[PDB]
Structures are given as C-alpha cells and as structure tokens.
Ligand binder design. Structure first.
Ligand SMILES: [Zn+2]
Lengths: 21, 30
C-alpha cells in the first residue's frame, strides 16, 4: 500500500496525508 | 507539491513533515 508505492513508483504529499492520526 | 520517490527512513521523514505533531502510523507490508 503506501510504503511500497512511494518507493517502487511515486507518491504525493496528499496521499501521505491519509496516514496521519 | 511535487510527486515523490520515497524509500526507507526517507518515507518516515516525509510523514513526520506532513503529519507533524498530529503524528502518524507507519505500516509497511510483510
Ligand atoms: Zn538515503
């Protein structure tokens, strides 16, 4: 899901914001 | 914002930045 994607592909700060508490 | 190539600890620094003191969960896969 998130960890993998930012690393194998690319990811945006908006996607990352989903993991915030 | 620009798309980002983030691996390892670099990803947890990005999270830290975006969530700040709201904090976050770091959940890799298996
Ligand atoms: Zn490095």
């Amino acid at each position: 899901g998130i960890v993998e994607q930012c690393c194998t592909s690319i990811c945006s700060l908006y996607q990352l914001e989903n993991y915030c508490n | 914002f620009v798309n980002q190539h983030l691996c390892g600890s670099h990803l947890v620094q990005a999270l830290y930045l975006v969530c700040g003191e709201r904090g976050f969960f770091y959940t890799p896969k298996t």
